[PDB]
Design a protein around this ligand. Sequence first.
Ligand SMILES: NC(=O)c1ccc[n+]([C@@H]2O[C@H](COP(=O)([O-])OP(=O)(O)OC[C@H]3O[C@@H](n4cnc5c(N)ncnc54)[C@H](O)[C@@H]3O)[C@@H](O)[C@H]2O)c1
Ligand SMILES: NC(=O)c1ccc[n+]([C@@H]2O[C@H](COP(=O)([O-])OP(=O)(O)OC[C@H]3O[C@@H](n4cnc5c(N)ncnc54)[C@H](O)[C@@H]3O)[C@@H](O)[C@H]2O)c1
Ligand SMILES: Cc1cc(C)nc(SCC(=O)Nc2ncc(Cc3cccc4ccc(Br)cc34)s2)n1
Ligand SMILES: Cc1cc(C)nc(SCC(=O)Nc2ncc(Cc3cccc4ccc(Br)cc34)s2)n1
Ligand SMILES: [Zn+2]
Ligand SMILES: [Zn+2]
Lengths: 301, 301
Amino acid sequence: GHMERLLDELTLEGVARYMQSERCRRVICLVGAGISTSAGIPDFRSGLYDNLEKYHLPYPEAIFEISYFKKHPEPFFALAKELYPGQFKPTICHYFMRLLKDKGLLLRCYTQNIDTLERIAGLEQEDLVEAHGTFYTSHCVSASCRHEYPLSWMKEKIFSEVTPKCEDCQSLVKPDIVFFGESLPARFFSCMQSDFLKVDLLLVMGTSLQVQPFASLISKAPLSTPRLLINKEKAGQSDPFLGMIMGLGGGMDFDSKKAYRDVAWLGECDQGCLALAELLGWKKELEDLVRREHASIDAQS
Amino acid sequence: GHMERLLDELTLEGVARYMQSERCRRVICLVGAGISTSAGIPDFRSGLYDNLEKYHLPYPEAIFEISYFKKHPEPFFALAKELYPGQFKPTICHYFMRLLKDKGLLLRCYTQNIDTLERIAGLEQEDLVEAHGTFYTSHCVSASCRHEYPLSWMKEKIFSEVTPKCEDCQSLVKPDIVFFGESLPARFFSCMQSDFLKVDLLLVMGTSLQVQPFASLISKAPLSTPRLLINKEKAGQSDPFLGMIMGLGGGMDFDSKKAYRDVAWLGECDQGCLALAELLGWKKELEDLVRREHASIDAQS
Ligand SMILES: NC(=O)c1ccc[n+]([C@@H]2O[C@H](COP(=O)([O-])OP(=O)(O)OC[C@H]3O[C@@H](n4cnc5c(N)ncnc54)[C@H](O)[C@@H]3O)[C@@H](O)[C@H]2O)c1
Ligand SMILES: NC(=O)c1ccc[n+]([C@@H]2O[C@H](COP(=O)([O-])OP(=O)(O)OC[C@H]3O[C@@H](n4cnc5c(N)ncnc54)[C@H](O)[C@@H]3O)[C@@H](O)[C@H]2O)c1
Ligand SMILES: Cc1cc(C)nc(SCC(=O)Nc2ncc(Cc3cccc4ccc(Br)cc34)s2)n1
Ligand SMILES: Cc1cc(C)nc(SCC(=O)Nc2ncc(Cc3cccc4ccc(Br)cc34)s2)n1
Ligand SMILES: [Zn+2]
Ligand SMILES: [Zn+2]
């Protein structure tokens, strides 16, 4: 009558032992804004509403709407200048994912971040699903053109306060982030199905699991696949699911007597990753990697 | 600073007046199991767990898993016989949607139902997105074959307790419902984006908005598009959303002082549709349509 229990206990220690077993070959990370707050990028939960007042929008959410952007792009680009990070140093948490890549354990990193820090940390396009898009590239919005621009070009336009126009056709050029009204990227839909059939461990970091796609993505994992949340607070829990599909419905179950596969480690993402690395025997490798990669960035300033 | 308010008040009466205005051209219905309970099809909230005991499954949710189906299909087909409706008479609510179709107001009916009653009521494939698939058709599971079978063929196999095999290759033939492990239908992904840009009114009937895709589909509507829920109980509400995207995040807001576009009519779906029809001047047309279509079904028994 009972599900296979791949974790020997619902703790970080049980997750580590499972990770070291033959059974754990494919890890998927789901990462959000919480993994970049220690890099100096605020998550807007400690808000945009104040930044937005000066632009005299019809309502605050108009800043996210693709239709409003196309008629009045100046507020977005002015906000983009205000919000542009002053440096791009990936965190311990990003480099933990680089370790997973280099050890052959990373099936995919799904991110809702647009800050490009995953790429800076050495994850490649094939490792990544940027689910809310990214600033890494931008495109001309004209359907017959679609000329691509790199972040260095977009940055210069943002900082010079020149509304970016396409060099081929003079249409607007928009960062490849997902504005409201736009579909999630094609990349997301082509990977999700296949990935979530093959996943042996789901690592969820720095997200409250309230926005799409992550809010529902956690439920696509096989029922036996363990799920570790590293976050400041619990996320993804709900009341016991009362509909047809029973245990397949609803979210994380950390605390009930039916709990069998989900673990919550509450604290800083960087500290959680370092604690997990330590259990795995990777703490020196991770510390060495962070030191060298941060130094490589510091050496170019 | 404020959103356009298309409803003059948050009541069924305000929705009706909006529906009669030039502004309301494209209605999308999101319908679930609650619209078919008055047709004698239980929703499993007044449960499957008892039906499942006899099959001696490894755990109850194994009945929904595509991998378990492919190894051991007999429990599914035995359950399918137990659950097979004894008649197929669409409800007042289904015929309300047929009225929307015939008056040119129906952009799309998204359904999570697998019972085929929408089709019986006269909605055509182009009107429908069967988001959890359907029993209407079945397919051979072999990738190189994929032979399609109609419901009359599947029904006969279910009732004779003969495990359905393909006539071309002898592989399993599976109803086109979405088992766990399977993607939502291609049809869903090709319509959703376009539809939810054009929607003037979202009518949500007979669903608790807890499973995907409906749980998140409500948030894809334009911020000004009114949303009417007709259901036994309130659904889709959440705590005020505290993340970046503000009003774009979280669900229905029926009851706060910020409420501006969502309306909950609590009761039977059939009674809600009849009440709305009455406000619109359609009550006689709907009653006449139900009487003739139910008679046409009764005349073939
Ligand atoms: N870095 C970025 O790219 C960035 C920054 C701000 C907002 N956003 C956007 O806003 C949305 C954010 O949604 P989300 O679900 O990813 O994030 P979210 O809105 O849930 O906020 C981050 C979550 O992480 C927690 N958190 C913050 N700092 C942490 C730390 N150091 N350690 C552990 N937990 C921490 C918070 O308590 C919260 O639960 C996305 O659309 C995203 O693109 C992105
Ligand atoms: N008819 C069917 O095809 C059928 C039947 C049972 C289950 N299911 C499947 O189970 C899942 C159901 O999810 P869902 O969100 O659509 O439904 P759900 O699980 O939310 O259950 C139906 C909802 O409608 C309400 N309800 C029931 N009868 C009602 C009536 N006469 N008037 C008003 N409200 C009523 C219930 O209180 C509940 O809120 C889907 O996967 C679906 O395919 C389908
Ligand atoms: C490379 C780079 C550049 C910039 C401007 N920043 C960042 S990370 C910091 C940050 O919070 N910047 C942000 N820029 C815009 C933000 C808010 C916003 C507005 C309009 C459409 C949006 C569509 C999708 C998303 Br997700 C966010 C959107 S929030 N990294
Ligand atoms: C035409 C027809 C035939 C049958 C059997 N019934 C129905 S409606 C009644 C009913 O509840 N039948 C049902 N049949 C199977 C049900 C449960 C189930 C099991 C395995 C995989 C599934 C995958 C997706 C879904 Br949604 C439900 C699934 S529930 N109409
Ligand atoms: Zn161009
Ligand atoms: Zn075949």
